[PDB]
Design a protein around this ligand. Structure first.
Ligand SMILES: [Mg+2]
Ligand SMILES: [Mg+2]
Ligand SMILES: [Mg+2]
Ligand SMILES: [Mg+2]
Ligand SMILES: [Mg+2]
Ligand SMILES: [Mg+2]
Ligand SMILES: [Mg+2]
Ligand SMILES: [Mg+2]
Ligand SMILES: [Mg+2]
Ligand SMILES: [Mg+2]
Ligand SMILES: [Mg+2]
Ligand SMILES: [Mg+2]
Ligand SMILES: [Mg+2]
Ligand SMILES: [Mg+2]
Ligand SMILES: [Mg+2]
Ligand SMILES: [Mg+2]
Ligand SMILES: [Mg+2]
Ligand SMILES: [Mg+2]
Ligand SMILES: [Mg+2]
Ligand SMILES: [Mg+2]
Ligand SMILES: [Mg+2]
Ligand SMILES: [Mg+2]
Ligand SMILES: [Mg+2]
Ligand SMILES: [Mg+2]
Ligand SMILES: [Mg+2]
Ligand SMILES: [Mg+2]
Ligand SMILES: [Mg+2]
Ligand SMILES: [Mg+2]
Ligand SMILES: [Mg+2]
Ligand SMILES: [Mg+2]
Ligand SMILES: [Mg+2]
Ligand SMILES: [Mg+2]
Ligand SMILES: [Mg+2]
Ligand SMILES: [Mg+2]
Ligand SMILES: [Mg+2]
Ligand SMILES: [Mg+2]
Ligand SMILES: [Mg+2]
Ligand SMILES: [Mg+2]
Ligand SMILES: [Mg+2]
Ligand SMILES: [Mg+2]
Ligand SMILES: [Mg+2]
Ligand SMILES: [Mg+2]
Ligand SMILES: [Mg+2]
Ligand SMILES: [Mg+2]
Ligand SMILES: [Mg+2]
Ligand SMILES: [Mg+2]
Ligand SMILES: [Mg+2]
Ligand SMILES: [Mg+2]
Ligand SMILES: [Mg+2]
Ligand SMILES: [Mg+2]
Ligand SMILES: [Mg+2]
Ligand SMILES: [Mg+2]
Lengths: 131, 67, 122, 200, 169
RNA sequence: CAGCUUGUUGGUGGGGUGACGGCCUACCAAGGCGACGACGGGUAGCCGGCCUGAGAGGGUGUCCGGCCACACUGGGACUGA
RNA sequence: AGAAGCACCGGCCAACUACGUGCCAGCAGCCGCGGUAAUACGUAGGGUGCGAGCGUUGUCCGGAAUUACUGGGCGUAAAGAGCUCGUAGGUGGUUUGUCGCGUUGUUCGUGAAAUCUCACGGCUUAACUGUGAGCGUGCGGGCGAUACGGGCAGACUAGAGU
RNA sequence: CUGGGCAGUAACUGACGCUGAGGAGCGAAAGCGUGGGGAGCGAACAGGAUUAGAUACCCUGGUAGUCCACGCCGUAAACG
RNA sequence: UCGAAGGUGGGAUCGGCGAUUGGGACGAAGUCGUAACAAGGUAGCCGUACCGGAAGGUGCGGCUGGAUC
């Protein structure tokens, strides 16, 4: 059934980035709304908000496109799967497109990027490479 | 086993090659000075001198017994 | 294929075949060389090839090819057998070292002379 | 072992004059042999093999010794073609050539090999000595008043002395300032194709 | 003064009533030597009449390859028909390391420092198309900042910021 | 190779040992291991290392250095720290 | 002045002509070469690669992303069990609190010497050798972090069942 | 006599879910066991024609079997 | 008491040899057919049954990786 809700989150963003939709909508959780903040601070999406659905809450994400039809998100890739968990120390944090990408590292100090978890010296779980 | 209790430990550990957390179990024989332990029984142990051929542990205390 | 399958039934590479048996770990191996005779090749490439049924000291019986022109092997000559397999002969996987125990070298060689076994000039 | 053969023959195959000035070259600038004037097939392995052959017979270095120079050129920081020509240049017979104490490369090899040179007052007779920084290259006190050494006295002007070494006066002794980087190295050869040869 | 390298020439055929009618194809790579490269196939009856068509097609399909001063910006991997070419950047000392098909596209585009490896089919036509599909995936660090709305100092790493200013000074 | 184990798994009282201990002995309880491969068959001294490889891995255990085992084959004590 | 050889020269793979030979003699790692003009067999000349060595065979790793964790596949190429039910196992929606086993930070003990990479030093250079630092992917003890996985005690109705 | 499915109401339980090595059940047709039944069709069979031959195609006949009851077999291009 | 080697006994397991015999692969330019590829001259294959020098033939069910309107 519905396992791995974060890989569904990346999939719903890929399948509407690849179809030039202006916005997505998806069921809400507190881990999705913290990943969506890291996608906003790095400039891969524009502003997201939280609506109110029938049951629970709901997350609605505006996507960003260039002056022409240029994608702002060149890919997405879930890295730590629920069948194979991937953890990384602070001296071998993953390097995504040589530095032009972002890996969403899950540290004890919250969700951080590669650069934010390198100069704070903390490691953790590697959720996804956005780039 | 007449003053001897049998404890099923558990241990989780990375696979050396594939990186998946693997759950494996053991069975150890521990020592009771008084045979009060049913089937269930979250126990706590501490390893000792060799008490028999295969006994190496002792029952320290019992928490949240067989319900 | 679903990582838990590789934990249960892991990978295993294919079985390598022993590509040259009957020497059993030796780079050369001598024999007794019975039945010096002559065999024909396959459907193209017709000639008369010079072979021998050498009985190596591994207590096995293999068929060795005699390179070069001219040889002096009759029935009980001590030959020294190395590897290498002749393509147009179907079941021959061994060769006689020329310039060995009882194989003289090929006479009148002046090119390449180290294969086929030959002193320079006297 | 040394080559000890014809020197123009390996300047014609590589299509490049290796020694300094030659009249046997430029009368026949094509490779030797009975099939000398034929159209050669410009492979990629041929451009990488012959470029390594430009570096061996310019310096007189055999293959198992030139390969060990590559094994530490790729292992030092910086580049690989830079530091390969750096450690080839610091050979002591190449120091005698650039300092103007010999005519060609094959006599700068003998004057080191026959024991006509000290370094720190230490009698060397190996051509593959690698001079470090601040090394003096002095001539033996016995080997003055000698014919190949007095011919290097008045002829100290026709070839340029590089900037990484310095020659001084009546004592013909060579002072090594630093190891040369790129610019003061004479270029008959490009350097990136030797690195690409060993990658095969 | 362009660079051009013919990669492969094969004699294709066509069976008719009488017999066989032969022809020649010749895959040609034409590059600027600095940043541009094009690929044109070309085919004709005569072998120099087919290289002459390969150059005139390759000069009509130029595309800019984003360099940084000797190597590519980030590792890519492109998919041809069934060819797979992995590109990986390099330190400025090591030359081009590629097979014979992918070396032609990279030396003509002007790359000096590259690590290439073909993973899929061994066909010389599709390895070239996979390398072109890999070079389209490359994108500039000043173009990844306009795509994200950030400055360049926090979308590029610290290494390849000062690797650009050592080229033009 | 799919059922192996009866001093086998545990307890008490003695004996033994440099020392804990079915290590041994008498009685009492009926257990212990196993599909996460018990019992069996084939092979092998183990490691720091060595060779290859972009790395991950793959093959190997030769000099040197650590440890183990054996001294014509099989068993046994004695002397002594 | 006392001191040079060995293989190769059709493609892979650097390096070609002449004569003898006529499916013969023979070559060869592959696929192929030789049937009266052979750059592939034998010789001579020439050439290339190395050089006190050069080649052949045996053995292992690479190339082989042809056991694939890094890094593959399964409509027709090799490959979806005839189909379902279910045991062990693997996996798990939203949310509050907590323990700190996994994870992660830091520090002490240990990871012998030699070999290995770096930097200097000593044998005329180099191999070799000494010293200093890394390495030793780990494991044990103490003290921090709680985002995520998991354990414990609850809550919720969207999945599932009635 | 009896199994499943779908839609609506949102009354109820509150993660009870999915898959599932071994295993177990079901499983076209042919076949096999005991006993029934047997119109038509029809392997084996026989005769005729065709043909160099015709152990086949085509034709007239025709036994098992096809059908029923209770068991076994457990295979199919069991396929989208 | 325990106890190595030795002696007797019935089994377990892995290999050699064997008159004779079953198939498999490859050889040459052998003998008898023509089953498949075209509607391959009766559309082909799959499971099963019986039969026949040999391919194969026919029954029952199935597939299109064949047709037909
Ligand atoms: Mg006791
Ligand atoms: Mg030497
Ligand atoms: Mg086109
Ligand atoms: Mg593909
Ligand atoms: Mg392939
Ligand atoms: Mg191939
Ligand atoms: Mg007893
Ligand atoms: Mg006692
Ligand atoms: Mg006792
Ligand atoms: Mg042994
Ligand atoms: Mg590899
Ligand atoms: Mg040893
Ligand atoms: Mg020994
Ligand atoms: Mg002895
Ligand atoms: Mg004593
Ligand atoms: Mg060539
Ligand atoms: Mg001729
Ligand atoms: Mg020849
Ligand atoms: Mg070999
Ligand atoms: Mg591999
Ligand atoms: Mg191999
Ligand atoms: Mg495959
Ligand atoms: Mg699938
Ligand atoms: Mg098929
Ligand atoms: Mg298939
Ligand atoms: Mg199916
Ligand atoms: Mg099953
Ligand atoms: Mg669970
Ligand atoms: Mg969860
Ligand atoms: Mg050490
Ligand atoms: Mg020194
Ligand atoms: Mg050392
Ligand atoms: Mg610690
Ligand atoms: Mg309720
Ligand atoms: Mg199920
Ligand atoms: Mg039936
Ligand atoms: Mg019957
Ligand atoms: Mg019946
Ligand atoms: Mg009946
Ligand atoms: Mg009849
Ligand atoms: Mg009939
Ligand atoms: Mg009924
Ligand atoms: Mg049944
Ligand atoms: Mg089947
Ligand atoms: Mg069906
Ligand atoms: Mg027999
Ligand atoms: Mg038929
Ligand atoms: Mg037919
Ligand atoms: Mg017919
Ligand atoms: Mg037919
Ligand atoms: Mg019939
Ligand atoms: Mg039918």
């Amino acid at each position: 059934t519905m396992t791995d809700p974060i890989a569904d989150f990346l999939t719903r963003l890929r399948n509407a980035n690849s179809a030039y939709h202006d916005e997505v909508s998806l069921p809400h959780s507190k881990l999705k709304a913290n990943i969506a903040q890291i996608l906003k601070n790095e400039g891969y999406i524009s502003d997201f908000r939280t609506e109110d659905a029938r049951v629970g809450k709901s997350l609605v994400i505006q996507l960003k496109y260039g002056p022409s039809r240029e994608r702002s998100i060149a890919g997405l890739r879930r890295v730590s799967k629920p069948g194979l968990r991937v953890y990384a120390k602070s001296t071998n944090l993953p390097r995504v497109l040589g530095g032009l990408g972002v890996a969403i590292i899950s540290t004890s100090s919250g969700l951080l990027t590669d650069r934010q978890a390198a100069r704070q010296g903390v490691g953790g779980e590697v959720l996804a490479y956005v780039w | 086993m007449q003053k001897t209790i049998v404890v099923e430990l558990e241990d989780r550990m990375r696979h050396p090659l594939y990186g998946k957390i693997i759950r494996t179990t053991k069975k150890v024989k521990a020592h009771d000075e008084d045979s009060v332990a049913g089937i269930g029984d979250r126990v706590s142990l501490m390893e000792t001198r060799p008490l028999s051929a295969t006994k190496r542990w002792r029952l320290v205390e019992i928490l949240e017994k067989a319900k | 294929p679903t990582i838990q399958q590789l934990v249960r039934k892991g990978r295993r590479d294919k079985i390598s075949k022993v590509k040259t048996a009957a020497l059993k770990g030796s780079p050369q191996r001598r024999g007794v060389c019975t039945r010096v005779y002559t065999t024909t090749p396959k459907k193209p490439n017709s000639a008369l090839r010079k072979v021998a049924r050498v009985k190596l000291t591994s207590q096995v019986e293999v068929t060795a090819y005699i390179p070069g022109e001219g040889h002096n092997l009759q029935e009980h000559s001590m030959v020294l057998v190395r590897g290498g397999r002749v393509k147009d002969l179907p079941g021959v996987r061994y060769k006689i070292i020329r310039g060995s125990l009882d194989t003289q070298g090929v006479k009148n060689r002046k090119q390449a002379r180290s294969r086929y076994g030959a002193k320079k000039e006297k | 072992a040394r080559y000890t053969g014809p020197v123009t023959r390996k300047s014609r195959r590589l299509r490049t004059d290796l020694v300094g000035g030659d009249q046997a070259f430029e009368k026949r600038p094509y490779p030797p042999g009975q099939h000398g004037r034929a159209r050669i097939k410009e492979s990629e392995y041929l451009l990488q093999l012959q470029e390594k052959q430009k570096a061996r017979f310019t310096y007189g270095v055999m293959e198992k010794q030139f390969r060990r120079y590559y094994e530490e050129a790729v292992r030092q920081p910086g580049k690989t073609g830079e530091e390969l020509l750096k450690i080839l240049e610091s050979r002591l017979d190449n120091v005698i050539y650039r300092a103007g104490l010999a005519r060609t490369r094959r006599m700068a090899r003998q004057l080191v090999s026959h024991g006509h040179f000290n370094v720190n007052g230490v009698h060397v007779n190996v051509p593959s000595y690698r001079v470090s920084q601040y090394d003096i290259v002095d001539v033996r006190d016995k080997s003055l008043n000698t014919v190949p050494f007095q011919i290097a006295r008045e002829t100290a002007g026709e070839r340029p002395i590089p900037s990484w070494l310095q020659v001084v006066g009546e004592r013909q002794r060579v002072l090594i300032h630093q190891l040369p980087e790129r610019a003061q190295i004479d270029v008959p050869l490009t350097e990136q194709l030797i690195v690409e040869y060993y990658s095969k | 003064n362009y660079l051009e390298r013919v990669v492969a020439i094969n004699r294709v055929s066509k069976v008719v009533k009488g017999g066989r009618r032969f022809s020649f194809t010749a895959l040609v790579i034409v590059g600027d030597g600095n940043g541009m490269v094009g690929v044109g196939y070309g085919k004709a009856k005569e072998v120099p009449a087919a290289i002459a068509k390969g150059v005139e097609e390759a000069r009509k399909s130029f595309f800019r390859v984003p360099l940084i001063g000797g190597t590519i910006t980030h590792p890519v991997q492109g998919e041809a028909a069934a060819g797979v070419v992995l590109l990986r950047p390099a330190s400025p000392g090591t030359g081009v390391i590629a097979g014979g098909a992918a070396r032609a596209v990279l030396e003509c585009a002007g790359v000096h420092d590259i690590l290439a490896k073909s993973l899929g089919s061994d066909n010389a036509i599709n390895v070239v198309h996979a390398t072109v599909a890999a070079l389209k995936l490359l994108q500039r660090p000043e173009e990844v900042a306009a795509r994200r709305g950030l400055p360049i100092e926090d979308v590029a790493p610290a290494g390849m910021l000062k690797a650009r200013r050592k080229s033009e000074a």
